[PDB]
Amino acid sequence: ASVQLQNVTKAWGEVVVSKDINLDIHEGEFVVFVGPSGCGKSTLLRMIAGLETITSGDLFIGEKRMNDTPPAERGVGMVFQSYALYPHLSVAENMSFGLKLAGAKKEVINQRVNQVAEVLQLAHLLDRKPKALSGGQRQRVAIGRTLVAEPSVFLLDEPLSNLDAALRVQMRIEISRLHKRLGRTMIYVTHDQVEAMTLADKIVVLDAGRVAQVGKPLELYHYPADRFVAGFIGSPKMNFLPVKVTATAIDQVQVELPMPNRQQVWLPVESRDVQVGANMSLGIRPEHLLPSDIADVILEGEVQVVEQLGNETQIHIQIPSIRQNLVYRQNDVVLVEEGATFAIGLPPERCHLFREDGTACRRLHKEPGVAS
């Protein structure tokens, strides 16, 4: 149902992990959290399901406020980190687990499962036991338990965690079919920025329990929240560097690089909140860094490394004196022996920056797909 939260919080006593977070996951969604480990993302999902305490603030699940309620009641269920599989009971039995206990009636029980088992591609593995199966088969059925039950809200503390290249994907898309077909709510969590973006109706860049940001996949990519948000979602991490806000006005913000070039230059900034003399920091991905020739924003420098990723290439690159080196993606080959020089252009628009602190300078540059 139209789940949600408000000033929720927590603190293993002293240890305040959660931090007056908030959200508004209306029906049909399939949000998904993510961030580095220690995020305790796990915690949040738990609080919501119920399998952990609601230290402060509150939460609902449509027309209710299940803080003070057992896990079972809130019409929920979910496949855990381990998997949560009964070493004792087999596939046939373990699945028909949830329905079995509270309920009754063999008929509804069996058909319901085979129907799902079929989809899971597990009509055959009805009888066989738990230990007796592949790595993936365990998880597959695992998913099936929560499934057969149909506890309105499908949470998922990292199911596709432990697996191969293909399966991650396969089961992934399947989830997609399930979600769309059913349309029920569906929170989730993990790492694979990929998984994230892929399924992701909306998201949440966690950060030590705090809600750094909310948004569409793209909104996150194009319109980051700040240094952290950008730093996360990016094949190699996004590039970065010093600056000195030379000047400003209405919808632009000059700045310049810390070394010989002096090349001040504008950028489609928000401008709001931008004192001058402000030693800010200039963000930008390898995904954008155009060639040496074309654009204005020259940027010559010696070449550091050369990731011949075949179906493309990349190159680290020490500017005359930036601190850490620059990065550099692009399609196809690029012989480029090291030690020698090389360089490229900073188009402005596809760019980012922020204050001494870290909050970001909203952007002007009306990018793709991004409705406003």
């Binding site: 399998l51 305490t53 003070d68």
Partner: protein, 254 residues
């Protein structure tokens, strides 16, 4: 986890009944308390003090022999493959964990034979007793080897490189590694020696070199405030047991 579902209800019933349980299985020890006067014009009584000292002499060297043997012999078993390893261990386990009834029968016969040629270790003695126990490795080799294998292999491999013959690799390298078990076997070996009874009783004729195990047994005929002296002995008993039982307790590593 969450749990509004009548928390206080289960806590009390569980908690209280729990209390009753300890309490009952405590009264017995408690009465021991209800007396404790060891050492008109009476005096001396049956000398437990020496009994205790012997138990140590018995248990102490007893364990040493146990570990020395379980460990060295076992060594061959785990690492150094050879003719019929799976079967013998298979055997020793089953073989020994027999109900040592009448084990004494042969034993008496045997020790009789032993004491004559080979003095000291023969019947009626400390050494004769320890020797009897030794065949206890069977349960232990199984455990000593089992831990052995868990540590990873290569460690030996690198070493094999730098000259650690079976022993150097084993001792310098491997053993101090597998020490936790050494203690486990040692400590547990120690307790059985004390909580001995059939064997110690049989070989040990003398009044003097009784074990704490042997001597306290006597207070069967003169019950009724003689038994009282026994409580005192129990007092003497809780010292070794409470202590050593307790020391081992910390061992619950994690």
């Amino acid at each position: 986890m969450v749990q509004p579902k009548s928390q206080k209800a289960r806590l009390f019933i569980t908690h209280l009944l729990l209390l009753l349980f300890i309490a009952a299985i405590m009264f017995p020890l408690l009465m021991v308390v209800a007396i404790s006067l060891r050492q008109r014009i009476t005096p001396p009584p049956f000398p437990v003090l020496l009994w205790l000292w012997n138990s140590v002499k018995v248990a102490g060297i007893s364990a040493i022999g146990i570990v020395a043997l379980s460990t060295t012999c076992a060594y061959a078993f785990a690492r150094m493959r050879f003719p019929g390893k799976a079967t013998l261990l298979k055997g020793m386990l089953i073989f020994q964990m027999f109900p040592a009834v009448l084990s004494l029968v042969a034993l008496y016969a045997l020790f009789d034979r032993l004491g004559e040629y080979i003095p000291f270790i023969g019947l009626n003695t400390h050494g004769g007793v320890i020797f009897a126990y030794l065949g206890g490795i069977a349960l232990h080799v199984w455990t000593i080897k089992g831990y052995f294998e868990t540590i990873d292999s290569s460690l030996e491999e690198a070493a094999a490189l730098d000259g650690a013959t079976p022993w150097q690799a084993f001792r310098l390298v491997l053993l101090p590694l597998s020490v936790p078990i050494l203690a486990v076997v040692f400590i547990l070996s120690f307790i059985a020696a004390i909580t001995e009874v059939p064997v110690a009783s049989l070989l040990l004729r003398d009044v003097n070199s009784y074990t704490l195990a042997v001597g306290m047994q006597q207070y069967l005929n003169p019950q009724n405030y003689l038994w009282g002296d026994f409580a005192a002995a129990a007092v003497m008993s809780a010292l070794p047991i409470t202590i050593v039982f307790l020391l081992a307790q910390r061992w619950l590593v994690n």
